[PDB]
Amino acid sequence: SKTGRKMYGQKGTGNARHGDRSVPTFVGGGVAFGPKPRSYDYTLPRQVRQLGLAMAIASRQEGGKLVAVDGFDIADAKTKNFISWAKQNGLDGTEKVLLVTDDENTRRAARNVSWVSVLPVAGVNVYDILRHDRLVIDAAALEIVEE
Amino acid sequence: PRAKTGIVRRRRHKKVLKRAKGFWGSRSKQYRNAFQTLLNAATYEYRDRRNKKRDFRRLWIQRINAGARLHGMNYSTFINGLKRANIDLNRKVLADIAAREPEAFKALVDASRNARQ
Amino acid sequence: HDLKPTPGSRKDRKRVGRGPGGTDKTAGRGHKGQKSRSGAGKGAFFEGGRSRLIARLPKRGFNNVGTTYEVVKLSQLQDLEDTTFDRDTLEAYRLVRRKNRPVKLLASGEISRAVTVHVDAASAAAIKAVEAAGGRVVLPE
RNA sequence: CUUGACUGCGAGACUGACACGUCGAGCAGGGAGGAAACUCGGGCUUAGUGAACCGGUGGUACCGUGUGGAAGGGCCAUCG
RNA sequence: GUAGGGGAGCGUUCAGUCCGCGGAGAAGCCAUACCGGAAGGAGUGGUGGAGCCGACUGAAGUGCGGAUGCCGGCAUGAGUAACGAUAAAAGAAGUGAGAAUCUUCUUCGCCGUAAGGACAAGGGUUCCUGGGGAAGGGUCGUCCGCCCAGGGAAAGUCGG
RNA sequence: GCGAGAGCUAACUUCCGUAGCCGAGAGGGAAACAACCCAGACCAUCAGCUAAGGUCCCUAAAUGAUCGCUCAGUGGUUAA
RNA sequence: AACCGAACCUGGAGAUAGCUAGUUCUCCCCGAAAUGUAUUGAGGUACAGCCUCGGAUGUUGACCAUGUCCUGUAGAGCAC
RNA sequence: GGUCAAGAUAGUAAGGGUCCACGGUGGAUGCCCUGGCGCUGGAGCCGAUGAAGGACGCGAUUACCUGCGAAAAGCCCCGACGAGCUGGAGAUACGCUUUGACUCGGGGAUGUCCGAAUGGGGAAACCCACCUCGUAAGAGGUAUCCGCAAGGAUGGGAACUCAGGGAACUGAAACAUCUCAGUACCUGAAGGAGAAGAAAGAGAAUUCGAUUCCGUUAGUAGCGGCGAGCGAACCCGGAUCAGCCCAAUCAAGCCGAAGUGGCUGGAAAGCUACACCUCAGAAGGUGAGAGUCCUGUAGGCGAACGAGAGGUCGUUGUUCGUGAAACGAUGACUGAAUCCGCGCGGACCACCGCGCAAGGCUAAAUACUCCCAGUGACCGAUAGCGCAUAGUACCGUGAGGGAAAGGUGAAAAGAACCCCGGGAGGGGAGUGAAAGAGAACCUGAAACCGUGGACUUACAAGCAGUCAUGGCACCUUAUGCGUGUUAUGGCGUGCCUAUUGAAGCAUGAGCCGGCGACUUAGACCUGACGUGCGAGCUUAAGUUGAAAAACGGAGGCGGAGC
Ligand SMILES: [Mg+2]
Ligand SMILES: [Mg+2]
Ligand SMILES: [Mg+2]
Ligand SMILES: [Mg+2]
Ligand SMILES: [Mg+2]
Ligand SMILES: [Mg+2]
Ligand SMILES: [Mg+2]
Ligand SMILES: [Mg+2]
Ligand SMILES: [Mg+2]
Ligand SMILES: [Mg+2]
Ligand SMILES: [Mg+2]
Ligand SMILES: [Mg+2]
Ligand SMILES: [Mg+2]
Ligand SMILES: [Mg+2]
Ligand SMILES: [Mg+2]
Ligand SMILES: [Mg+2]
Ligand SMILES: [Mg+2]
Ligand SMILES: [Mg+2]
Ligand SMILES: [Mg+2]
Ligand SMILES: [Mg+2]
Ligand SMILES: [Mg+2]
Ligand SMILES: [Mg+2]
Ligand SMILES: [Mg+2]
Ligand SMILES: [Mg+2]
Ligand SMILES: [Mg+2]
Ligand SMILES: [Mg+2]
Ligand SMILES: [Mg+2]
Ligand SMILES: [Mg+2]
Ligand SMILES: [Mg+2]
Ligand SMILES: [Mg+2]
Ligand SMILES: [Mg+2]
Ligand SMILES: [Mg+2]
Ligand SMILES: [Mg+2]
Ligand SMILES: [Mg+2]
Ligand SMILES: [Mg+2]
Ligand SMILES: [Mg+2]
Ligand SMILES: [Mg+2]
Ligand SMILES: [Mg+2]
Ligand SMILES: [Mg+2]
Ligand SMILES: [Mg+2]
Ligand SMILES: [Mg+2]
Ligand SMILES: [Mg+2]
Ligand SMILES: [Mg+2]
Ligand SMILES: [Mg+2]
Ligand SMILES: [Mg+2]
Ligand SMILES: [Mg+2]
Ligand SMILES: [Mg+2]
Ligand SMILES: [Mg+2]
Ligand SMILES: [Mg+2]
Ligand SMILES: [Mg+2]
Ligand SMILES: [Mg+2]
Ligand SMILES: [Mg+2]
Ligand SMILES: [Mg+2]
Ligand SMILES: [Mg+2]
Ligand SMILES: [Mg+2]
Ligand SMILES: [Mg+2]
Ligand SMILES: [Mg+2]
Ligand SMILES: [Mg+2]
Ligand SMILES: [Mg+2]
Ligand SMILES: [Mg+2]
Ligand SMILES: [Mg+2]
Ligand SMILES: [Mg+2]
Ligand SMILES: [Mg+2]
Ligand SMILES: [Mg+2]
Ligand SMILES: [Mg+2]
Ligand SMILES: [Mg+2]
Ligand SMILES: [Mg+2]
Ligand SMILES: [Mg+2]
């Protein structure tokens, strides 16, 4: 918001020449080359997303920090019981764990644990996985995510 | 995101300025004239490394000629004299002999005028 | 965080200006001139102010889209398809996807085993060589 | 005596930043002069020239907006 | 080695992750003879008082001496020019922390179809009283058209 | 510089041909001096040889040698 | 309404600007051009010419000798 | 030793210089937030029942702001909360409140004067009337246009929508058709959307079936001083689906798990030892960093009121510039058939196809963002809005233009009292962890001004450097490769720009600090590098999911050229 009116005369004055106070050489002016709202979202080739995810699981397998799992056992939606279950499975606390399952209550039991991040269904992705140390796969989704 | 200058310009500046202590007047207190003075300083440094190598040779030569002539010999004739008798001395060293040790320089003189005969 | 992109995947850009490193003063642009200036324009087909090559050259003939025939080769159908046959919706599922255009068959390289083909037209030597190998060619009514 | 001051082409060079420009063997149709070998696609040579665009005219039956026609364009020639 | 092309890097914010520091003291600031081929980087000490370094990766409002560039602060000219009509001042006395400048007295000087008096337009409390003295007053002020408080303006007949 | 025109066989002139340098070239020499002469600087050295150019003092280096010349400061700027 | 050969305010509006200024961190490698022709063109632009990077080739380049052909200047000469 | 003589050298600095120390100025830098910015999502009209916007008022004291309107920081009832309250304002006094205050939610009553203003006038916020009731006080009425009446209209609203009117710069490297562009601007009407809409259609399959919007077709078909440049549609894939009548659950709120001891510290959240809750480890506040101290979060509960025809001339529209110019569209003139009839299919005719003009309404997908909420590889005081708030101060007759502004401390415990001074200012004391935080209060750079100290300078020619050496001084990366400073010698034509050529007496520049210039976009073009698939490769709109991503083949690229 600077009027576009010429401030004063093109020659004469003895000053340097200016036309406006809305100019990027002007304190309080415009940014020359600022950021305007834009987008960064492209389409990475599908086969590469797939090969990726794959290679995530593969990487975590040579770990060996894969832990395939069937059924679970967490009483009725309680975090303390998640903690005991985890503890029986070697999850001391000294690792960060991604859990993927489709069962409402096991997630509902993990969540509030600092060191567990909780993911439903095929919310899976290379980032979240590679972010953490351990992966709780579970396993039910694994025999389908082969075929 | 934006990235101000924060801190960099002042560090650069102080660098120049701190190279520039003992410079007269604004040359040691204003950045630009410091930085500038320093460009010319660049020229002078590089040059004078070569040039001091030029200068010291000169000095040695002066002293040598002096000693040479004390004992009745020109320098040039003294140096062909030395090359003839295949004495192979630095003129840095020849100077120091000439200035520091009288009798020894004398001996080199006699050897050289012999090589001349 | 462990990961790194491939050597030579990502070159850092040109930051012209930014000191005598470096492209000093004029940022590539050279000294003075219309090319030096900052404005959107010339553009690309502007020679001198002159009289352009394209403008000096003779125009020939009108323009017409007509019909274009989608090419199918023999050599494709031949050697290693083992005749899953042609039909109409079969060709697609194998490899000659287009739509909106009529299909033509052309000679390509070689014929041997006999097959039944379903196109919209084909070349003389193609019908001739497809029959001389025992196969028939079908043009519509 | 004649209409080569010719159609369909062009191996290969000269020459120009490009566009131009210049020379040209040889093949076909089909002719001229010669008894004939042969020569002729203008003038001993080097100047006598104007790119595109839009339009005139003679041929041509390539496109022609549901189809068949016709207006109109396109092609070769050609004039301003 | 100039325009220009190419190559390897330094530093800055923000972002993800890893490491990890921090009231027995972070960033920032300050001094420094150490380190690196250069952008640069550490060691120690002084400052400061609550946040921050290193590594890899990502994205930029990412690096300044110039543009009679923009905003801001402070220099030079310099204790220089000037203090705004050449109508003019002197003494006593008073006051006061402080007086050539304020108050009183006595004179002196200058306007007197004005430099006196009364309206209009405009201004807006500048009027009166009592107080004040940072700044405003081209010096100084104890004073003021300045600052604070409180008062003051009255229409059947003037003007609408 | 050499080769020409133009110009007054003037110009630190103008326009071409040609070599080199400056341009974009630091270093030594020519007092000073883009261009001339020597010479192309990756960095360090209180090391040695040379180029052009120099060796009375300022100023590194023979007040060198031998046979002459000039006596005019010619040297240290022009002609019939 | 203190600058009128067309007032002032805001807007189109970041008008256009073949023009002048300005263009910021470091080191390493190579490294120009200011010529040609064409331009309502002459301090601007197109294409060549010259630079660099990459991929191809693989001595094709360079100098110098030998061989061979082309030339009408220097000089000279007076045959037109 | 004394006199004379000849010679050589020293110190003193009026002021200056370099360095060091210690301050002042000033407000960079770092940290911070009470203020902004964008995106997404929500929500969308007000007004004769007097609006938007104001004027004047209302206070124990009231200038500004807020709230209100002579019933005037407020009055009535209902609902919530349950102990404080008496606005920003922090200040004294008066007092109110468990008979339920204050605050929050919801309705009503009052609501001066101006402003569409509307009784008449008027230089807005002021002047002057008339009528009915009333005892007066007071109350109500007195505009224009449609209508019989009832009732409707006028005015305002950033963008968004449609309509009447409609630029130029500029691009064409000049310009006139052309382009900018039906953009800017002006006017109108209206809504929370609006427009548009129910085929005399698109079209070429005798296919499709209201409109709008997205992708795509496609820079294709075409347009064009056939120059610059302009540029569809059909198909196909989506978003949302609709066609009827006439003329013969959210808005107050409540409930809500779990920790202590020792240590450092001014202060505990940090450290440490054991300990617990988690459908709750989102976040903020607490003297430094708190899952378990407070507010909260997950989860649950939750209200009386509240909310959901044809023609000819002149022209023009879409790719439509007189082109062979169809078709629509009107300004002028003229003017037919009604079913074996009518209108189209790009001059024009036949044929073959699609269509029922001259009568109206219509939600949904779409646009926008004044306002509200969430988010952020957005900004943190020259940044971000012009404002850490102000359209104020200030400038202008006016239209209009238009600033800078930030920080004690955890807590005011805001320094009683003593000393110099009229005061200002300061020194103590006291508080504080620290006054190395004192209200010109976070850090506090540089320019610039001073005090003090080191070595220095009064025979000297200088781009102020650089090299070499000697003198003095100093010893925390420091007894050597030294650090500071100097004497003397050698050497040396500021920087940038622009140029054939710059120290140039050519340009720019007072100084330092901050701001300050090669970027973004498209699903465009063309190369280099890399990666995934590979004779194949890939999706776009969108759909669903969403502390992620998956689907989606319409389309596009290769595949054959001439
Ligand atoms: Mg601001
Ligand atoms: Mg040497
Ligand atoms: Mg580069
Ligand atoms: Mg520069
Ligand atoms: Mg320039
Ligand atoms: Mg034309
Ligand atoms: Mg014809
Ligand atoms: Mg014809
Ligand atoms: Mg180099
Ligand atoms: Mg980081
Ligand atoms: Mg930071
Ligand atoms: Mg500056
Ligand atoms: Mg000036
Ligand atoms: Mg200034
Ligand atoms: Mg004086
Ligand atoms: Mg003076
Ligand atoms: Mg004087
Ligand atoms: Mg005076
Ligand atoms: Mg006076
Ligand atoms: Mg006087
Ligand atoms: Mg007294
Ligand atoms: Mg007086
Ligand atoms: Mg008296
Ligand atoms: Mg008077
Ligand atoms: Mg009055
Ligand atoms: Mg005064
Ligand atoms: Mg007094
Ligand atoms: Mg008075
Ligand atoms: Mg009376
Ligand atoms: Mg010349
Ligand atoms: Mg040189
Ligand atoms: Mg030289
Ligand atoms: Mg010299
Ligand atoms: Mg010269
Ligand atoms: Mg020699
Ligand atoms: Mg000598
Ligand atoms: Mg005037
Ligand atoms: Mg401009
Ligand atoms: Mg414009
Ligand atoms: Mg080289
Ligand atoms: Mg030039
Ligand atoms: Mg070129
Ligand atoms: Mg060869
Ligand atoms: Mg001759
Ligand atoms: Mg003194
Ligand atoms: Mg008020
Ligand atoms: Mg009342
Ligand atoms: Mg109540
Ligand atoms: Mg309460
Ligand atoms: Mg009225
Ligand atoms: Mg014009
Ligand atoms: Mg033009
Ligand atoms: Mg309206
Ligand atoms: Mg017409
Ligand atoms: Mg038209
Ligand atoms: Mg019509
Ligand atoms: Mg700040
Ligand atoms: Mg005091
Ligand atoms: Mg001093
Ligand atoms: Mg003397
Ligand atoms: Mg002296
Ligand atoms: Mg010049
Ligand atoms: Mg040049
Ligand atoms: Mg000068
Ligand atoms: Mg100058
Ligand atoms: Mg000039
Ligand atoms: Mg000047
Ligand atoms: Mg590739």
- Which residue type does B106 have? K
Q: In what order do the strands lie in the sheet with C121-122?
A: C70-73, C103-106, C121-122
**C122 touches C105 (CB < 8 A):** yes
Q: Coil, strand, or helix at residue A67?
A: strand
Cβ C43 to strand H below 7 Å: yes
CA angle C67, C135, C69 (to 5 degrees): 10
Whole-angstrom distance, CA of residue A62 vs CA of residue C86: 49
Q: Which residues contact B86 (CB under 8 A, 6 or more apart)?
A: none
Token pair for A87: 């503890």
CA angle B47, B53, B54 (to 5 degrees): 85
Q: Which nucleotides of G are covered by protein (CB under 7 A)?
A: 3, 9-14, 16-28, 38-41, 43-47
Q: Coil, strand, or helix at residue A7?
A: coil
CA angle B112, B116, B117 (to 5 degrees): 120
Domain residue spans of chain C: 1-141
Count of structural domains, chain A: 1
Neighbours of A61 (CB within 10 A): 12
Cβ A34 to strand H below 7 Å: yes
Resolution (A): 2.9
- Which residue type does B87 have? I
Q: Coil, strand, or helix at residue C92?
A: helix
Q: Which residues surround ligand 41, an ion (CB under 5 A)?
A: C 32
Token pair for A62: 């040579």
C64 CA from H325 C1′ (Å): 21
**B98 touches B61 (CB < 8 A):** no
Q: In what order do the strands lie in the sheet with A66-69?
A: A66-69, A134-139, A97-101, A116-120
Residues in chain B: 117
Neighbours of B116 (CB within 10 A): 14
- Tell me which residue of A134, A133, A108, A132 sits closest to A120, measured CA to CA: A108
Tokens 């924060």: give the residue.
B6
Neighbours of C131 (CB within 10 A): 13
Which residues are registered as beta bridge partners of C105?
Answer: C72, C122
- Which residue type does A8 have? Y
A41 CA from H514 C1′ (Å): 37
Question: For strand C137-138 and strand C70-73, is the pairing parallel, antiparallel, or unpaired?
Answer: unpaired
Whole-angstrom distance, CA of residue C96 vs CA of residue C78: 14
**Residue B38 CB-density burial (10 A; 0-12 exposed, 13-18 middle, 19+ buried):** middle
What method was applied to determine this entry?
X-ray
